[PDB]
Design an enzyme around this catalytic site. Sequence first.
Site, short mmCIF file in Angstrom:
data_model
loop_
_atom_site.label_atom_id
_atom_site.label_comp_id
_atom_site.label_asym_id
_atom_site.label_seq_id
_atom_site.Cartn_x
_atom_site.Cartn_y
_atom_site.Cartn_z
N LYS A 48 46.13 29.76 34.41
CA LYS A 48 47.20 30.46 35.29
C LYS A 48 48.65 30.06 34.66
O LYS A 48 48.92 28.91 34.91
CB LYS A 48 47.14 29.93 36.81
CG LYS A 48 45.90 30.60 37.03
CD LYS A 48 45.37 30.11 38.26
CE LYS A 48 46.31 30.28 39.66
NZ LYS A 48 45.45 29.88 40.81
N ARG A 98 56.40 17.26 45.44
CA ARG A 98 56.81 17.77 46.92
C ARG A 98 57.68 16.62 47.68
O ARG A 98 57.80 15.44 47.09
CB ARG A 98 55.60 17.84 47.77
CG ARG A 98 54.95 19.18 47.76
CD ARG A 98 54.29 19.61 48.83
NE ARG A 98 53.44 20.69 48.73
CZ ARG A 98 54.06 22.15 49.69
NH1 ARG A 98 55.10 21.84 50.19
NH2 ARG A 98 53.22 23.16 49.28
N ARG A 151 36.83 35.48 44.58
CA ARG A 151 37.78 34.51 44.23
C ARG A 151 37.51 33.36 45.69
O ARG A 151 37.45 33.60 46.76
CB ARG A 151 39.21 34.95 44.37
CG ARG A 151 39.99 33.82 44.18
CD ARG A 151 41.51 34.50 44.08
NE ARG A 151 42.46 33.39 43.85
CZ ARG A 151 43.11 32.74 44.78
NH1 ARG A 151 43.05 33.30 46.13
NH2 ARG A 151 43.85 31.82 44.51
N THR A 162 49.85 40.52 41.46
CA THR A 162 51.09 40.96 41.94
C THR A 162 51.50 40.62 43.39
O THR A 162 50.69 39.76 43.78
CB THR A 162 51.30 42.29 41.54
OG1 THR A 162 50.36 43.11 42.43
CG2 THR A 162 51.02 42.92 40.30
#
Lengths: 446, 446, 446, 446
Positions: free
Chosen positions: B220, B73, B32, B278
């Site tokens: 995602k 942000r 990745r 996880t």
Amino acid sequence: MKKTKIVCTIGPKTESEEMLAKMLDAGMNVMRLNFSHGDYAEHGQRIQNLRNVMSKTGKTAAILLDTKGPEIRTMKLEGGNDVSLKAGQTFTFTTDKSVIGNSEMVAVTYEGFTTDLSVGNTVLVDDGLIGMEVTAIEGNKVICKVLNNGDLGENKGVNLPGVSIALPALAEKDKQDLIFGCEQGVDFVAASFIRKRSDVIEIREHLKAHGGENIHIISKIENQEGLNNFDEILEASDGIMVARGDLGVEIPVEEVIFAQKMMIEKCIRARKVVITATMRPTDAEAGDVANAILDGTDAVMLSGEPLEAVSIMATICERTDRVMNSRLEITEAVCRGAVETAEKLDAPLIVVATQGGKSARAVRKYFPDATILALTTNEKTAHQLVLSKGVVPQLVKEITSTDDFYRLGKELALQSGLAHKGDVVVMVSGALVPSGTTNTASVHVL
Amino acid sequence: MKKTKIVCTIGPKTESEEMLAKMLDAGMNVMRLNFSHGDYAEHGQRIQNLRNVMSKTGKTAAILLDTKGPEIRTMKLEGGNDVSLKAGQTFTFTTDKSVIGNSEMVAVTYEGFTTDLSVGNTVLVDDGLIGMEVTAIEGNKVICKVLNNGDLGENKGVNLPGVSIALPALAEKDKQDLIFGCEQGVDFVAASFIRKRSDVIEIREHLKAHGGENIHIISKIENQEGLNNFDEILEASDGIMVARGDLGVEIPVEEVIFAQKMMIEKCIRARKVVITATMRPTDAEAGDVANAILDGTDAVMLSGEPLEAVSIMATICERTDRVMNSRLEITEAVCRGAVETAEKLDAPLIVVATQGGKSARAVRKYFPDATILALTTNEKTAHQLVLSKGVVPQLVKEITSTDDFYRLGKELALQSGLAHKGDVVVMVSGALVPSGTTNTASVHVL
Amino acid sequence: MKKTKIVCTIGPKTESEEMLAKMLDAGMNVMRLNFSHGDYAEHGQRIQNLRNVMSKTGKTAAILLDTKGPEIRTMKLEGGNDVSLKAGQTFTFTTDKSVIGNSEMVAVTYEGFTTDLSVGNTVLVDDGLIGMEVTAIEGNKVICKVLNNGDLGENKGVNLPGVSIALPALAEKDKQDLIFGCEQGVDFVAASFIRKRSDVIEIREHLKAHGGENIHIISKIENQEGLNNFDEILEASDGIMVARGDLGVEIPVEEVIFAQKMMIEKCIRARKVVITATMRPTDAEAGDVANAILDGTDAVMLSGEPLEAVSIMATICERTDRVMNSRLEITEAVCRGAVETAEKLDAPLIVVATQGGKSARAVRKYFPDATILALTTNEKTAHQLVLSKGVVPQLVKEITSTDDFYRLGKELALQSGLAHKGDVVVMVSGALVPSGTTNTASVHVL
Amino acid sequence: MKKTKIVCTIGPKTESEEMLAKMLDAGMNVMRLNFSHGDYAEHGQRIQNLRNVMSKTGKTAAILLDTKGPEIRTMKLEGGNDVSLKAGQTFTFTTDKSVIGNSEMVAVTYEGFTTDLSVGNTVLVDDGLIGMEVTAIEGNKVICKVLNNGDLGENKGVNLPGVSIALPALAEKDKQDLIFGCEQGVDFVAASFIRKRSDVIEIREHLKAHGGENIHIISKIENQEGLNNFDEILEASDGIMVARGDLGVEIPVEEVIFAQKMMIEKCIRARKVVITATMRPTDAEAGDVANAILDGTDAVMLSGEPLEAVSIMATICERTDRVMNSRLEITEAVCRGAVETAEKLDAPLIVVATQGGKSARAVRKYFPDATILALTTNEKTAHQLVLSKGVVPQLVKEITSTDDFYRLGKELALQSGLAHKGDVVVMVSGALVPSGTTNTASVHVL
């Protein structure tokens, strides 16, 4: 309502009756009492407070006294400073309590340390933070090769994987805490550090010697040995407590989750209760819980943690419960059938008559969708079943006969608000057979 | 050998060809590249060293390029100093980037803040660290009651749970990293913060506009809005990445494990890949994983963490895989069958011909005990197969017909070391049908 | 022992109490009284001699009064001599009773012959010995072409297949025999030529005016109209009787074996009785029996046929019975339950309490391997259950409660020789619910 | 169309080419030639006219030679006159052929008549018309008690129930008939009175010495010894024939329908054909046939019976087959799969390539709803399959490979009118495996 039961350990910040009553609302179902600290004055008040709340509110609840258990410990370090042990170096354990530790050696609370051990064996300091192989033992000295680098702080726990340690099921103090349980009349006793079938006997033997006979024993599996002897231990016990962290220090990591799984499966088949103790919570934890409950645990327990903690565990218990399903694939045959049919007819509940609580257990095995309302004239039993999943016990004056039961049951189920007119409801019970035998089932519309 | 695939994030400490060749031995299957840091040169080097390693050893590996994605942000604080927010006090957000924050207000990097938000809503600063409810909005100002005590640092992450946030799909820098992907020819692109089907579309659209037509897009899921549009998101994506933490910040704790659960299920049914992400490891994690594996994820990822991490994650992958079972209850029929029969006959392997890789997917959806050996003339397809559970891809020159296929396949199967003389072996493939269609199975003895 | 019940038509050569006693030994369970002959004195005697052998040996058996019913018939022929009918020739039927037949025409007993009939219809002479198509109809004559060569003897039976004949439900004599039946207290009346629900209501209505309220009415299905309204007929009857030959005359040969199959299944699911009348016996016959049992008939039947016939029928009944299996896929729940568990536990018997015979039936539907021992304080009901497969009644003084029942049942179960100490035993019955509702099962070891 | 096959025994009244083709249109599928009568000229003609019809219409049909078989028979009576035998009387049998019987004694054709028998044995004369108990045997005589009254005509067939008769497998003219059947090339030889495995072998050796290797041996189970060795005889034969009547004479009555039931079951599982031979027809018979069908026989046979017979026979086959269902619970897996899959996708047909006919067989075992279309280059094989249930054979030029097969089968299927554009069709075959091996399956859209 959730079905899973929650076990909290109570303390100072939570022992007032006003606190306990709220905790009951948050979801608590059993009060744990950790014998690792406190005293008889305090605990006895703790217990008193719970019972006053119960009287004052009709709420039910169990009480479990948790045993300290044998323990090995490392002693004192020079100036109370952590030392750093280096891999391959030498390190020595001693039997002499006088001795002040340092990076060369350390004293242990366990006089039998030299004995049980052997060169070749593995020693594990502070939650397995540091391993070492015993090279030698001579006199009160345990000589070893450190297997890896680490900081040795004072009073760290020791573990010897594989070895059978000769301490007793019962510490000296451990015996006194039990008697207090019996005098007080606690519902359960979670025995610590149980390694083989005998350990359970000795506590049973002990509790019997002090009026404790109707006390359930919950064995705490915490190591390779108890794990190996699980069947035997489960056999001898009234229940089980999966000590994940504790066990985690003594065996391979990839095994823990599984051990917990095999233990829970075995308990369930066995008709015995199992408490699962895992590590707002971190997500690792919130799913660790949900997983325990999916694995089918009766109860989850909360430790040194508090009203928000309860409620979260309580909103987790509900969320995971509401999506589980029955597990249908003599008492057995009747009970399964009850449940199945319970389900086919869409019964909201399943009233049950139990003296010793066994039939509520046997019914609760199949993970019924309906709530079990359990009838009893026995008070300890009414208290104990509060531990079991989906059960909701009710002490009752008497049940003259199978027909009286059905009649009574129907009055009760209707009073619970748990059922209503037209509701179908399945009744399980004993008929012309001693206790410990479930054998009759009956459908009835309210 | 395990069957669950491992995805590791590579870095400086892990980029040499010598390390990468080790990590492959340790269990890694997909590199990745986190576009969150680094630069084109490094990454490109990283990729080259992998491919070198590949040529050198004949080992295979895929390559994911994970995206940074959009964000809301907080800005600058006076003196660059942390302010202390007190509960119930008022605190205002501002669209005006020029404003320098302090205890009373701070500016957010998101111009539509005022627009998407609305009184009553919850605003979450710095990873959930501090929450605030929106009391009012006027001009470029979002007035709030601060829900709990906390320190506001600068550049903190904002999350407005439940809200539909109007930000775009790709970052501008995002646009640039994707092209680099398309130039370096990575195997998969994991899009970030995917909230609705169109976001998926925009990436595809961008990828095609630069040679990226065959790259798979793994989407995602990190929030309520993506969660709710899952079906469509999944539909348009090639696969999915369960982002536990990110999700953990946006919805209820008791939901996350259940969101993951429903994701994996729907992925598998859908024939698409799902990667689990996880939080030696704390037991919680070592189980978290297993559970993800048990729930059926194809692969599990490893982040900022290294050679031992991989190895352990492996042993955990092999240990949980060794006890799962197939899940048998036109492409489908054929495929399902192929699997049950594979199993009835005791077949150690299921040779499969694939162009696009869908057939291998089809087989795997059934969780075979057997390894799926995949034949393909297509390299992108062969690489991407690495991300798939239990699949072992092989690039092959060509396959002239169903019977050539059987003969070749036999040769290959025996060469793999995966099967031997006397081993039955099933072989699925298309016959007189366009790609995307599987429909023929044939049993064979080696 | 066999479980299928055998029905015997009694006559002169078999009415002695001596004979009957031997017949009951061979397997007989029901006394069939064919009202198509004999007289009220002889039947009555036949009845009393049975009842006598009953008192004398504790044996049990029932008595069905089979109706003669309405019918169409050809009348008198010149010189009472048989005329030969030639194919294609003309032949006419007449409504006028005075008319004496000959080869050109004959009168029918049925005045509605012209009216119900219609050109093109088939007329069937003498058990379908001769067919004829209706070509014309004028006044009281029905002109027909002969379809085949044959001799018409006098008093021949007429069949109009497919036709809906308007005869009444009951012959005038039928209402007369019904009363005697009532006077005599038979168990069942098997009604002849049942066509539509109204037929059954008339019968039922007539028996009630006669005190026959508890007499079970069994519908005889003999033609297409009856076969069409079956479901509605079954609903109003207490059971059915498949009259094969009679049906064979009235519809396509390929349909009879399946009409039988349909009637038996429906009657089973309906928890109602079905007696099977098929045509040493011819293997065809032998098989034909075996299959009605396989199709699951509660009972078979013996006609004009005698001790060897009863015995064989019986060795076939046992032969077939011994290889059947249960059929498991509120009352249903419990009863399905009970048998399955009965089977799980090896229960050689299933005691059941019943007033109305309903639950014995209910249990019966599942084709239990265990014998059903049925306790009842009602004797009518005890008699009628003789008709039911595998059930074995027992008259009992009373049962005060569910528990009284269990204790009582195990005494009786053991005394039956049907079960022994150690044997497991299922018990069904009602609890707090009116008659017509089974709802409780209980296992017990003798 | 019906799927079950019909066998018609052919005669003078039915041997014309005009009669035969009408018959095939009636439903006939195999021509049964009974070697119990007729001659080489007639039977050969009988086959001629058949083959001819086939030529002139493209109809297919198989031809079975049926064996007379060895026998024991009673001989000449004085004056060629029938003698009446009275019960209990004495009667004697003699091995001496010269002796001319009378009411006291009759000689038998079978020399081993004394030897195989034994006192206490039952002797059945003329199709069991007269029973007798052997009381004594001495020298060439068999002394017995007549069990019942009856007339003994000359040349009556004898049956010794339960006895193991040492006759040869083949009667001397039985070998001649076998050579004719070879020269004439019949498809199947049905052997007579098969008793043990070695009989089946002998014949297989006899056809082989005469080029009969491709003729399938259908063994006829007539009595107790053969029923005993059925497992081994089934094993060695190519199918079987349930000779009900002859069985009906040789064993208990409640036993025959079961014997037929066991034979057919073991047949189906063995992938072998079974012809059921039972006793407009009487209901008993029309239901008797249906039951054979329901039991699953490939084919039903017609005897001394004609065009209406075939019709009704056929209309029953259709009425029955239309309500049967598949029976799904290497070659096996592939075939079961194929069928199941075939059913899931709704395929109307299942093409199968076959040389030896085996896979047509393995596929049929499952009782497919879809018609089997079997492609073969072996015309013997193609003829043989007509005997097979629901199969439709087709001679074809060749099949070069699995792919060609698919291509070919697809044209053929659509040409057959048995399927259409859009219909899915499942195809099985062999692939890289010797004959006798099925192992490939593939779904296709027409």
